[PDB]
């Protein structure tokens, strides 16, 4: 679906510097221009397409997708992507054992929900100023952490990831439980934990956005189906 | 560290210059080193140990730096 030219324009073909590479990414690498590794778009594209297809399929059976990206450059974008296809996301720091330790995190989620309710639906007001402030702070904290996953209910049936090396904890968790992983994997990253590897530039913003958008579209399509 | 006071130069300035020169020479340090006999082994050990320390400072710390403190 996503063309090669577009990818090139975005800056998918660019990778990291040669000294920071992983030799498990040697198949997906093409060459090294100006001492910086170039990802092979001929090998990338089909894989990407396959991944997209898989995602679509998942969506079709009413699968829950989780969008992970805690880089802070593409935190805004990932959330947007998630919301477009009304799916869940973790745009700020992944809580260690979010999925493996769901049952504890489910309590946190509940608490957050309660807080939200108190804030909005109650309309009681009349609260001690320090206490109120504290409550507000707590709410903020919760929202930041678990805003995207509050309506997830259980565990997701697939896990889309913007960087494998950065979100290794998440990936690891997904492997322990057996959730399918769809990781964007730059040359420095490790592809071994990832099920459906996508060789591409995690760092560049435009590229990331592109990666998101197609995925979102596919999810939407699946839903429609 | 031979020095000559320039025409219309302050005393203090001259002194400072002299001190600087001395520092550059590493004369005091040298003297300190030759106060007592260092066994060859000891000398070796210090040199290697120092080198190791330097290496540690350079690389490990750099690695640490990549990650933010707060």
């Amino acid at each position: 679906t996503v063309s090669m030219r577009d990818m090139l324009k975005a800056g998918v073909h660019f990778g990291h510097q040669t000294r920071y590479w992983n030799p498990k990414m040697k198949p997906f690498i093409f060459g090294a221009r100006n001492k910086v590794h170039i990802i092979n778009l001929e090998k990338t594209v089909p894989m990407f397409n396959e991944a997209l297809a898989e995602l679509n399929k998942i969506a079709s059976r009413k699968g829950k997708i989780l969008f992970v990206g805690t880089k802070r450059a593409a935190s805004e974008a990932v959330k947007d992507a998630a919301l477009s296809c009304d799916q869940f996301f973790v745009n700020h720091r992944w809580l260690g054992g979010m999925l493996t330790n769901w049952k504890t995190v489910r309590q946190s989620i509940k608490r957050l929900k309660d807080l939200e309710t108190q804030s909005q639906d109650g309309t009681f007001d009349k609260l001690t100023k320090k206490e109120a402030l504290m409550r507000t702070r707590e709410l903020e904290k919760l929202e930041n952490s678990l805003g995207g996953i509050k309506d997830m209910g259980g565990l997701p049936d697939a896990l889309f990831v913007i960087d494998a090396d950065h979100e290794h904890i998440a990936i690891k968790e997904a492997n322990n439980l057996g959730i399918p992983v769809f990781a964007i994997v730059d040359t420095n990253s490790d592809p071994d934990g990832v099920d459906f590897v996508i060789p591409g530039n995690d760092d560049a913003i435009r590229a990331v956005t592109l990666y998101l958008g197609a995925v979102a579209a596919t999810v939407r399509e699946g839903r429609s189906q | 560290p031979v020095i000559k006071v320039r025409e219309n130069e302050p005393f203090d300035v001259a002194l400072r210059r002299f001190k600087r020169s001395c520092e550059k020479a590493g004369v005091l340090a040298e003297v300190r080193r030759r106060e007592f006999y260092e066994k060859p082994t000891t000398e070796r050990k210090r040199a290697k140990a120092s080198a190791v320390k330097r290496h540690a400072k350079k690389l490990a710390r750099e690695n640490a730096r990549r990650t933010r403190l707060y």
Binding site: - | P1, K24, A25
Partner: protein, 66 residues
């Protein structure tokens, strides 16, 4: 940033006193290869040259001596 690599000299000359004088201290000492940035191979040669000069009283062993 070595001089001798750029010049492309085959061997450093003890007679070439001026050149040597750039690599010797105000106190007479030979200057480290960290500071000058001389290449290792050349540095040794330079040192040797300096030593030779000192033997021939072309360069001084030290500032104080007389």
């Amino acid at each position: 940033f070595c001089r001798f690599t750029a010049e492309g000299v085959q061997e450093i000359d003890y007679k070439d006193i001026a050149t040597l004088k750039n690599y010797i201290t105000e106190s007479g000492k030979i200057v480290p290869s960290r500071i000058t940035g001389t290449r290792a191979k050349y540095q040794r040669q330079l040192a040797r040259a300096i030593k030779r000069a000192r033997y021939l009283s072309l360069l001084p062993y030290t500032d104080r001596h007389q």
